[PDB]
Symmetry: C2
Subunit: 189 residues, 2 copies
């Protein structure tokens, strides 16, 4: 409730002006929560940031899990849906908008928060990889190399394409990435 409320408005605000620039008082006024109770839940802004990232990444991890393990069709369709959904959102703020926003301040971020960003990204990659090795095993799809390596490529492409979409104000980098993934993650013979 109140703890979740704080975390949610912290993520919103961070999304906009970044974490480092988000003053405690800005947070509390927006969240409409007294300073005393914030400290009941978090001993510091830093601890708050850690909890914020963890909540952010667990939720994204759970949505990705549901898409790739309980979505539409075979594993290939679900992998494609991961790019397709990123598009579908646009009609215009990008996905992974938080990781990107925080990427610009990582050196000023605490070690715990940088660690929480790393784990979030690695978790996403691990899910993609599991989806790839699954589709490989039931012949939904084929690709070259080992699954982790290929999942890492898919993750970096998604991130780069989102950034490029944000800079150009265009869906084209995303559609293009998706078209590329259709070749690389191919339906079998």
């Amino acid at each position: 409730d109140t703890r979740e409320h704080l975390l949610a408005t912290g993520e919103q605000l961070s999304l906009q002006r970044g974490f480092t620039g988000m003053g405690l008082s800005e947070l509390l006024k927006t969240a409409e929560v007294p300073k005393g109770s914030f400290y009941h839940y978090f001993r510091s802004k830093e601890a708050f940031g850690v909890a914020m990232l963890e909540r952010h990444y667990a939720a994204y991890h759970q949505r990705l899990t549901e898409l790739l393990q309980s979505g539409e069709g075979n594993y290939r369709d679900r992998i494609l849906a991961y790019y397709q959904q990123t598009l579908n959102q646009f009609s215009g703020t990008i996905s992974g908008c938080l990781t990107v926003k925080l990427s610009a301040e990582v050196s000023d971020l605490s070690e715990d928060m940088r660690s929480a960003m790393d784990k979030g990204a690695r978790g996403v990659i691990a899910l993609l990889s599991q989806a790839l090795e699954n589709g490989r095993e039931n012949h939904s799809l084929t690709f070259s190399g080992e699954p982790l390596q290929q999942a890492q490529v898919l993750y970096a492409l998604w991130l780069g394409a989102n950034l490029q979409a944000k800079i150009s104000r265009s869906f084209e980098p995303l559609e293009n990435a998706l078209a590329h993934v259709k070749n690389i993650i191919a339906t079998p013979a």
Copy 2:
């Protein structure tokens, strides 16, 4: 003239270190050792300065990249791989991660003038078009093969480079860059014969 370049250069170093919106004018002028009136003689404002800064930065990068792709050592496939290999080398220097301006300024496009976002968009379009021409050349002299249109493939290569850099920076590992290089080697292949 030499003063003008001095301001632009200083601005680039500082933007790269702390973001563009983060860089305050007085910090810029004190670092460049340039009086306030002189700055305002060259540039209408901080915003104007940023556009000039970016245009300078992309002009130089476009030229380096042109020399690499149009007349580098080996064939067009070798030159494309070198783009990723150079990225690997120029990732950090002397221990310190040497950032990338496009990558750093990505997270600010939200809060930048259209003039600056457009300078970046233009910067990116220039890189992509160079990579695209290299790919087409490579097909035309039989140096390399890949799936699809050159522009499409060039855009993926750029998106890949961008995302891998982002990820390398966050994780402080060059694994995303080595992994990108290895994947490009397989995607942009040598012809069967």
